[PDB]
Coordinates of C-alpha atoms (C1' of nucleotides) in Angstrom, one line a residue:
Chain A
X26 CA -148.1 -113.6 97.0
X27 CA -147.0 -110.9 99.8
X28 CA -145.4 -107.8 100.1
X29 CA -143.4 -106.4 103.6
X30 CA -143.4 -102.5 103.7
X31 CA -140.5 -100.9 104.5
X32 CA -139.9 -99.9 108.1
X33 CA -136.8 -97.1 107.6
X34 CA -136.6 -93.8 106.0
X35 CA -133.9 -94.6 103.9
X36 CA -135.3 -97.0 101.9
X37 CA -138.8 -96.9 101.2
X38 CA -138.5 -100.5 98.4
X39 CA -141.0 -102.8 98.8
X40 CA -139.5 -106.6 99.9
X41 CA -141.3 -109.8 98.9
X42 CA -142.9 -112.2 100.6
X43 CA -141.2 -116.1 100.0
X44 CA -140.8 -119.5 101.1
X45 CA -138.0 -118.3 103.2
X46 CA -139.2 -115.1 103.9
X47 CA -138.6 -111.4 103.1
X48 CA -136.8 -111.1 100.1
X49 CA -135.1 -107.9 98.8
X50 CA -136.5 -107.6 95.2
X51 CA -133.2 -107.2 93.3
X52 CA -131.2 -109.9 91.5
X53 CA -127.6 -110.0 89.9
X54 CA -127.4 -112.3 87.0
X55 CA -123.9 -113.5 86.2
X56 CA -122.6 -112.1 82.9
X57 CA -123.3 -115.0 80.4
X58 CA -126.8 -114.7 81.7
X59 CA -126.9 -111.0 81.6
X60 CA -126.3 -111.6 78.1
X61 CA -128.9 -113.8 77.2
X62 CA -131.2 -112.2 79.3
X63 CA -130.6 -108.8 77.6
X64 CA -130.8 -110.5 74.4
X65 CA -134.3 -111.9 75.1
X66 CA -135.3 -107.9 76.8
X67 CA -133.9 -106.2 73.4
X68 CA -135.7 -108.7 71.4
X69 CA -139.0 -108.2 73.1
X70 CA -138.3 -104.7 73.2
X71 CA -139.2 -104.2 76.5
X72 CA -137.8 -101.5 78.3
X73 CA -137.5 -102.9 81.8
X74 CA -135.9 -106.0 82.4
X75 CA -138.6 -107.1 84.9
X76 CA -141.2 -107.1 82.1
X77 CA -138.8 -109.5 80.1
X78 CA -139.1 -112.2 83.2
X79 CA -142.7 -111.4 83.2
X80 CA -142.7 -113.0 79.8
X81 CA -140.0 -116.0 80.5
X82 CA -142.2 -116.9 82.9
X83 CA -145.1 -116.9 81.4
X84 CA -143.8 -119.3 79.0
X85 CA -142.4 -121.9 81.0
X86 CA -146.0 -121.9 83.1
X87 CA -144.8 -125.6 82.3
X88 CA -142.5 -125.6 85.1
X89 CA -145.2 -127.7 87.0
Chain B
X26 CA -111.7 -102.0 79.5
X27 CA -113.7 -104.4 76.6
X28 CA -113.0 -108.1 76.7
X29 CA -114.4 -110.2 73.7
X30 CA -115.6 -114.1 75.3
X31 CA -120.4 -115.2 74.6
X32 CA -120.6 -111.6 73.9
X33 CA -118.6 -108.3 75.0
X34 CA -118.3 -107.7 78.9
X35 CA -117.2 -104.8 80.1
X36 CA -114.8 -104.6 83.0
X37 CA -114.9 -101.6 85.6
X38 CA -111.5 -99.8 85.4
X39 CA -113.1 -97.9 88.6
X40 CA -111.9 -98.7 92.3
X41 CA -115.0 -98.8 94.3
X42 CA -116.0 -101.9 92.6
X43 CA -114.6 -104.3 90.1
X44 CA -117.8 -105.3 89.2
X45 CA -118.4 -106.0 85.4
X46 CA -120.9 -104.6 83.4
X47 CA -122.2 -106.1 80.2
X48 CA -122.5 -105.2 76.4
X49 CA -125.6 -105.2 75.2
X50 CA -127.5 -103.6 71.8
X51 CA -128.1 -101.0 73.7
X52 CA -125.2 -100.0 75.6
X53 CA -123.3 -100.7 78.6
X54 CA -125.9 -102.1 80.4
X55 CA -125.7 -103.2 84.7
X56 CA -125.9 -107.1 85.8
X57 CA -128.0 -106.5 88.9
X58 CA -131.8 -105.4 88.0
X59 CA -135.0 -104.4 90.4
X60 CA -137.5 -106.9 89.7
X61 CA -141.1 -105.7 90.4
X62 CA -143.2 -106.5 93.2
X63 CA -146.1 -108.6 91.4
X64 CA -142.7 -109.8 89.1
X65 CA -140.5 -111.1 92.4
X66 CA -143.1 -113.0 94.3
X67 CA -143.7 -115.3 90.7
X68 CA -139.5 -115.4 89.9
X69 CA -138.7 -116.4 93.6
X70 CA -141.1 -119.1 93.7
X71 CA -139.7 -120.8 90.8
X72 CA -136.4 -120.3 92.4
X73 CA -137.5 -121.8 95.2
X74 CA -138.9 -124.2 93.6
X75 CA -135.9 -125.6 91.7
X76 CA -134.3 -125.2 94.8
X77 CA -131.5 -122.6 93.3
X78 CA -129.2 -121.2 95.9
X79 CA -128.7 -117.9 93.3
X80 CA -131.2 -116.5 91.6
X81 CA -129.0 -116.2 88.3
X82 CA -129.7 -119.8 87.9
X83 CA -133.2 -119.4 87.9
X84 CA -133.0 -116.9 84.9
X85 CA -130.6 -119.4 82.8
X86 CA -133.0 -122.1 83.7
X87 CA -136.1 -119.7 82.5
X88 CA -134.4 -119.2 79.2
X89 CA -133.1 -123.1 78.7
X90 CA -136.7 -124.0 79.3
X91 CA -138.4 -121.3 77.1
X92 CA -136.1 -121.2 73.8
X93 CA -139.5 -122.8 72.0
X94 CA -140.9 -119.3 72.3
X95 CA -137.3 -117.3 72.7
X96 CA -136.1 -118.0 68.7
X97 CA -139.1 -116.6 66.9
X98 CA -138.9 -113.1 68.4
Chain C
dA19 C1' -145.7 -89.2 102.4
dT20 C1' -144.9 -94.0 100.2
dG21 C1' -143.9 -95.9 97.0
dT22 C1' -141.2 -96.8 91.9
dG23 C1' -136.9 -97.8 88.5
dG24 C1' -132.4 -98.2 88.8
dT25 C1' -127.4 -97.7 90.6
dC26 C1' -123.5 -96.0 93.8
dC27 C1' -120.2 -97.7 97.5
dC28 C1' -118.6 -101.1 99.9
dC29 C1' -118.9 -105.6 103.2
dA30 C1' -117.3 -110.8 102.7
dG31 C1' -116.7 -114.9 99.6
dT32 C1' -115.9 -117.0 95.3
Chain D
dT30 C1' -105.8 -111.1 93.3
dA31 C1' -109.9 -110.3 90.4
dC32 C1' -114.6 -110.3 90.5
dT33 C1' -119.2 -111.3 92.4
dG34 C1' -123.1 -111.8 95.4
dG35 C1' -126.2 -109.1 98.0
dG36 C1' -126.8 -105.4 101.8
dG37 C1' -127.6 -100.7 103.1
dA38 C1' -128.2 -96.5 101.0
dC39 C1' -129.8 -92.5 97.6
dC40 C1' -131.5 -89.3 93.1
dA41 C1' -135.3 -88.5 90.5
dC42 C1' -140.0 -89.5 90.1
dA43 C1' -144.8 -90.3 91.1

DNA sequence: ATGTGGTCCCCAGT
DNA sequence: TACTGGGGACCACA
């Protein structure tokens, strides 16, 4: 897993390196997925959504 | 404006974006989130490996494939 | 300086 | 003709 350091002086957010190349680290959820996702996020009591998808990925480790 | 449909889904009556937010147990939330470098790397991996075009589907799949944990919360 | 979470403004597409 | 997915920028922060 890698990172790509920003080039511009306007946005300094890092991108990540995936199978399809540099990707921006934001995702958009659809309205039904948002509500279910945020269900989980508020249940675990996590402040930042990203910690909720770390949880959702630990579990599901049987993705393989 | 509020619509009941799922749950409660707020329609922005603004004008530079008709993008709609969702009403959560902690108020109006945006449907766009910023994954940490650490998370994004693992999240996109499973998106690629499922071949899903749009990454919202991947979160749908995660939740699908993890209700065995979600209910006991 | 160089990243961070998070969201605004807005383009192109569903 | 209403909403969306995502890029580009940006405020406060660290």
